Amino acid sequence: ITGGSSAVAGQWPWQVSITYEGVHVCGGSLVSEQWVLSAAHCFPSEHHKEAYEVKLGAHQLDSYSEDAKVSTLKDIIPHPSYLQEGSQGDIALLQLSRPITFSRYIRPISLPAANASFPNGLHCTVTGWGHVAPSVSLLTPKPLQQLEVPLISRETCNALYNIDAKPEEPHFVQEDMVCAGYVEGGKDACQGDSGGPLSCPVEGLWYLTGIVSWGDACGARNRPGVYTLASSYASWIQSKVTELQLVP
Numbered sequence: 001i002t003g004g005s006s007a008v009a010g011q012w013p014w015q016v017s018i019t020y021e022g023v024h025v026c027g028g029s030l031v032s033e034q035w036v037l038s039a040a041h042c043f044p045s046e047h048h049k050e051a052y053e054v055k056l057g058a059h060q061l062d063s064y065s066e067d068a069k070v071s072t073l074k075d076i077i078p079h080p081s082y083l084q085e086g087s088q089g090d091i092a093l094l095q096l097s098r099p100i101t102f103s104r105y106i107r108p109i110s111l112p113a114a115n116a117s118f119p120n121g122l123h124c125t126v127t128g129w130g131h132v133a134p135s136v137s138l139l140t141p142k143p144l145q146q147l148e149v150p151l152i153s154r155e156t157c158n159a160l161y162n163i164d165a166k167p168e169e170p171h172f173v174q175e176d177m178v179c180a181g182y183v184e185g186g187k188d189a190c191q192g193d194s195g196g197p198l199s200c201p202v203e204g205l206w207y208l209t210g211i212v213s214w215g216d217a218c219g220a221r222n223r224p225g226v227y228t229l230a231s232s233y234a235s236w237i238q239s240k241v242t243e244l245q246l247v248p
């Protein structure tokens with residue numbers, strides 16, 4: 001996250017770190033005792049499931065915390081519609097090897113209904129442990145970063161992405177996507193933040209409005225972060241979670 005601030009410990013208790021071979025690659029969101037939502041682009045099919053970990057209840061990644069917990073994965077389920085980079089369906093369900101126990105530091109985020117609408121301009125928050133500036137990693141001990149971002153329609157977002165666009169870097173905000181951020185530079189998600197939550201405040205609660213789909217723009221002008229709408233996958237998520245629910 002560039003142009004944001006350090007969160008306080010436990011402020012975003014659904015935020016997880018996803019590692020591959022011990023290295024943080026993406027964010028994710030805890031949504032139940034055994035499920036994490038992240039982005040499909042974070043999980044190429046050639047990668048081995050057993051090489052991933054999920055770190056929950058963390059604030060400073062490099063600091064020891066008795067409140068943090070680390071898990072492996074039993075399954076990685078990208079949405080079947082996801083094809084190449086940039087395609088619709090950039091969302092994945094990650095099944096933890098064992099269910100975790102909720103705590104004040106480890107809590108699920110509420111999922112929006114299929115028909116839940118979040119209005120243009122709503123001030124949501126994106127969080128993550130990604131770069132704090134282009135090509136510049138968050139320094140040890142790596143406190144979780146947060147940034148307030150107003151929602152931007154996919155239509156406005158597409159027109160912005162077309163300003164000084166390059167054929168070598170194609171972008172299209174799909175029908176299952178929304179944007180959030182600023183027309184001017186300096187405040188957005190960066191490499192390492194993708195897969196993480198866009199958390200929106202509605203009627204006293206917080207909802208997982210979006211999952212960072214394209215978050216590598218890192219504060220470039222006319223490049224607000226692109227997010228997969230969780231509402232577009234409410235039906236699929238409920239189907240998977242219900243069929244695969246564990247014994248209590």
Ligand SMILES: [Cl-]
Binds near residue numbers: 033034035241
């Ligand atoms: Cl569950």
Ligand SMILES: [Cl-]
Binds near residue numbers: 154155156158159
């Ligand atoms: Cl459009």
